[PDB]
Amino acid sequence: RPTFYRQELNKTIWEVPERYQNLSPVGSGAYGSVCAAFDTKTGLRVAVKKLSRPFQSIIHAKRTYRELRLLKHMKHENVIGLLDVFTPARSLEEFNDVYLVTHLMGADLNVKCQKLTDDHVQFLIYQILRGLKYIHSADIIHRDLKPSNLAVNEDCELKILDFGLARYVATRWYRAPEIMLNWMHYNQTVDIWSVGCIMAELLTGRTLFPGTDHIDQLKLILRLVGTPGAELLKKISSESARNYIQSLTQMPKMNFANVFIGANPLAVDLLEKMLVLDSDKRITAAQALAHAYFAQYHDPDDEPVADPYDQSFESRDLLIDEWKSLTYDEVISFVPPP
Ligand SMILES: Cc1ccc(C(=O)NC2CC2)cc1NC(=O)c1ccc(-c2ccccc2Cl)s1
């Protein structure tokens, strides 16, 4: 067992191995606070997250297990990877805290100075889609993809954070309209809608759909893509969602070439394919990687998929101590990457 040391950060005690030095709070992460740290074993700058009350509720205990299982499985260059997982607990009976360690990277994609050049956008979006192809192949979706959960280093290398966890006092600028309207006729291309929103913002320097509330958000989306057509309306099972759509003014679809003036025509074409209201017609991550916009980056021989991922726990209703014991087993069996 390594030697641990205690300190107070964010009005709570952090107890970590001596290996992690100079803990500095860098704000909140998903379900916990994150500290930047120096890993003395590897010489790498890392992000250490202390999960908040991981086993103090059934929802928390199951999400703790969900997150650790996800992190232990996902092994891809454009997907955040688990460098370490630890607990100061010496036994299952004392197991109450979970800490997770990943690369820090340095910044996220989220005040703005300027637009990004076309090659910079190609590289960033390519990396996002390459990471999404991998995540989606494990039957995992982000569901809350946005600039703040895209971690980038000084060389513009990118890793997706906080996927597989999500399922009106906040802006939902990158959310697919089908998740917002609870249709709930949706698939993995909800993340492709978010990619489209991000790409558009990187190219123009402006938020594509900066809705002031849930109502205004949909209004801005429909102003660009047009109101749902007859083919799409037929596929909506929800009476509540269908009623909402009809109550809105009929908007024509805008030609994106007139919205993204001066942009690479191939970027405009890809945006048209990503920002389709009908999720059955929206481009997939794998299809988007093959689009001519990424000709300089695309390599079909190096866009890997995930190994089969056992997610059967998702259907289970277990007690807090059962989720805790399963999580503990995962912590003790963890093998760090080379
Ligand atoms: C430490 C950690 C643990 C789990 C997950 C995660 O993605 N979990 C779900 C997949 C299952 C992400 C992180 N990293 C982080 O949360 C951060 C890395 C870099 C961060 C950062 C901090 C400050 C400023 C900019 C950045 Cl990118 S935050």
3-state secondary structure 71-120: HHHCCCCCECCCCEEECCCCCHHHCCCCEEEEECCCEECCCCCCCCCHHH
Q: Spell out the SS3 assignment of the chain.
A: CCCEEEEEECCEEEEEECCEEEEEEEEECCCEEEEEEEECCCCEEEEEEEECCCCCCHHHHHHHHHHHHHHHHCCCCCECCCCEEECCCCCHHHCCCCEEEEECCCEECCCCCCCCCHHHHHHHHHHHHHHHHHHHHCCCCCCCCCHHHEEECCCCCEEECCCCCCCCCCCCCCCCHHHHCCCCCCCCCHHHHHHHHHHHHHHHCCCCCCCCCHHHHHHHHHHHHCCCCHHHHCCCCCHHHHHHHHCCCCCCCCCHHHCCCCCCHHHHHHHHHHCCCCCCCCCCHHHHHCCHHHCCCCCHHHCCCCCCCCCHHHHCCCCHHHHHHHHHHHHHHCCCCC
Contact present, 280 and 220 (Cβ < 8 Å): no
Measured from the Cα of 104, ligand 1's closest atom is 19
Q: Is 67 exposed, middle or buried (CB count within 10 Å of its CB: 0-12, 13-18, 19+)? A: buried
Dihedral of the CA atoms 240, 245, 247, 252 (nearest 10)?
Answer: 180
Query: How many CA within 13 A on the CB side of residue 62?
Result: 16
Structure tokens at 82: 């688990």
Q: Is 286 exposed, middle or buried (CB count within 10 Å of its CB: 0-12, 13-18, 19+)? A: middle
Show contacts of 293-302: CB within 8 Å, 24+ apart: 293/122, 293/125, 293/264, 293/266, 293/267, 293/269, 294/122, 294/125, 294/126, 294/129, 296/119, 296/122, 297/122, 297/123, 297/126, 298/126
Alpha-carbon span 60 to 31, nearest angstrom = 9
Contact present, 327 and 320 (Cβ < 8 Å): no
Same domain (yes/no): 33, 122: no
Phi-psi map region of 143: left, alpha, beta (phi>0 left; psi -120 to 50 alpha): left
Alpha-carbon span 155 to 100, nearest angstrom = 24
Q: Is 58 exposed, middle or buried (CB count within 10 Å of its CB: 0-12, 13-18, 19+)? A: middle
Tell me the structure's resolution in angstroms, rounded to a single decimal: 2.0
Same domain (yes/no): 140, 76: no
Structure tokens at 23: 């803990």
Q: How many CB atoms lie within 10 A of CB 178?
A: 22
Alpha-carbon span 328 to 311, nearest angstrom = 17
| Pocket mutation for ligand 1, best pick of 48, 63, 80, 327 (most atoms within 8 Å of C-beta) | 80
- List, chain by chain if needed, residues with CB within 6 Å of any ligand 1 atom: 26, 29-30, 34, 47, 49, 67, 70-71, 80, 100, 102, 104-105, 107-108, 151, 161-165
- CA 71 to ligand 1 center in whole angstroms: 11
Structure tokens at 91: 């036994």
Q: How many CB atoms lie within 10 A of CB 157?
A: 16
Q: CA–CA distance from 155 to each of 89, 123, 145, 242 (Å)?
A: 38, 11, 21, 46
Q: Determine if residue 99 is labeled as part of a ligand binding site.
A: no
Alpha-carbon span 232 to 207, nearest angstrom = 26
Q: At what angle do helices 190-204 and 265-274 cross, to 10 degrees?
A: 150
Same domain (yes/no): 192, 93: no
Same domain (yes/no): 97, 185: no
Query: What is the residue whose two structure tokens read 């040391």?
Result: 5
Residues 6+ apart with CB under 8 A from 270: 199, 283, 288, 291, 293
Of 200, 206, 101, 191, residue with least CA distance to 149: 191
Question: Which pairing describes strands 84-86 and 158-160: parallel, antiparallel, or unpaired?
Answer: unpaired
Same domain (yes/no): 228, 170: yes
Measured from the Cα of 47, ligand 1's closest atom is 1
Domain CATH for 266? 1.10.510.10
Same domain (yes/no): 21, 58: yes
Of 141, 107, 144, residue with least CA distance to 124: 107
Same domain (yes/no): 100, 115: no
Q: Determine if residue 33 is labeled as part of a ligand binding site.
A: yes
Alpha-carbon span 297 to 207, nearest angstrom = 26
Contact present, 147 and 201 (Cβ < 8 Å): yes
Q: Determine if residue 27 is labeled as part of a ligand binding site.
A: yes
Residues 6+ apart with CB under 8 A from 243: none
Same domain (yes/no): 146, 101: no
Q: Determine if residue 31 is labeled as part of a ligand binding site.
A: yes
- CA 164 to ligand 1 center in whole angstroms: 13
Same domain (yes/no): 145, 285: yes
Q: Determine if residue 29 is labeled as part of a ligand binding site.
A: yes
Domain that holds residue 213: 107-305
Q: Looking at the 3D structure of the chain, how many domains does it have?
A: 2
Contact present, 48 and 16 (Cβ < 8 Å): yes
Same domain (yes/no): 131, 182: yes
Domain CATH for 313? 3.30.200.20
Q: Which residues are catalytic?
A: 162
Measured from the Cα of 150, ligand 1's closest atom is 27
Burial 92-109 (b: 16+ CB within 10 A, else e): eeebebbbbbbbbbeeeb
Alpha-carbon span 85 to 115, nearest angstrom = 38
- CA 86 to ligand 1 center in whole angstroms: 16
Contact present, 78 and 158 (Cβ < 8 Å): yes
Query: How many CA within 13 A on the CB side of residue 131?
Result: 27
Same domain (yes/no): 15, 28: yes
Contact present, 56 and 46 (Cβ < 8 Å): no
Same domain (yes/no): 37, 174: no
Of 94, 105, 83, residue with least CA distance to 20: 83
The alpha-carbon radius of gyration of the chain (Å, integer) is: 21
Q: How many CB atoms lie within 10 A of CB 188?
A: 20
- Going by alpha carbons, the residue nearest to atom 26 of ligand 1 is 107
- Going by alpha carbons, the residue nearest to atom 22 of ligand 1 is 26
Q: Which amino acid is at 82?
A: L
